[model samples]
Target: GSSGSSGATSYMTCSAYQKVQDSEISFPAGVEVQVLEKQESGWWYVRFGELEGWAPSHYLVLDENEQPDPSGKESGPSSG
Candidate 1:
């Protein structure tokens, strides 16, 4: 659905976000959390302690993040 890259000018936004819960995340197969900061590239950002990297658009979706303006959905908005 999303067309962007980790290093693209615009990263893919999060479709939804959930508590990682476990250290191992399923990846592209599961829903991806959007990066904290909006990047030109659709690269989703993930934090690993001191390390921070970006993921592909297909790997992430905007979700869970609550905003002053509702996402127009019963759920919420994301920041990927």
Candidate 2:
């Protein structure tokens, strides 16, 4: 069971940089982050390690299993 609302965390789907506003922050692909909120345009306010800012949702994937995607799951953390 999953609620439609965004949760407290998300992961980087691809390498991304946040500069939609005045501040600039960036993260590499596969980084885990804390999601503060999301916007209708697909941008999200997130905190990656020590950096906090906005990043496009398309570049942010919310995979709880640490599987980056449908294809990525084949090589996830639990594959150990």
Candidate 3:
């Protein structure tokens, strides 16, 4: 058996309303997790705390400095 991370570090931008699972993992908001992959359906495979699962991609912020709007939806990205 093999065990290790093959994904980039990622963070949650919003709270997951329900306990959804993928690859047997899930997480709460503001918690940091390892993003295994970015799915086409706007979801991500992540390892949060001690669990690995699928989370909404929007909730998964690739940039640590980036902030997500309290609401799940955003008008658009800001200009530099």
Shift of residue 45 alpha carbon in model 2, Å: 0.2
TM-score between candidate 1 and the true structure? 0.28
- Lowest summed lDDT window (length 10), candidate 2: 66-75
Candidate 2 lDDT, 34-76, residue by residue in tens? 7788789888788867768877877776565664555645456
Report how far off residue 14 is in candidate 2 (Å): 2.5
Candidate 1 achieves a global lDDT of 0.45
Tell me the TM-score of each prediction against the true structure: 0.28, 0.55, 0.53
Q: What is the per-residue lDDT of model 1 for residues 1-80, given as tens digits with 9 covering 90 to 100?
A: 88565642322333333335453233333332434444576545565334445554455543357668754786655675
On a 0 to 100 scale, what is the lDDT of residue 65 in model 2? 66
Off by over 4 Å in 2: 1-7, 18-21, 64-80
Note the residue pairs that clash in candidate 2.
none
TM-score of 2: 0.55
Highest TM-score: give the candidate number.
Answer: 2
Error of 1 at 29 (Å): 6.6
The predicted structure with the larger lDDT, 1 or 3, is: 3
Model 3 misplaced regions, further than 4 Å: 1-7, 21-24, 64-80
Candidate 3: pairs in clash: 25-52
- List, residue by residue over 1-80, the lDDT tens digit for candidate 3: 76665637667547653444435454556667777777899777777667667777776665548666687655666694
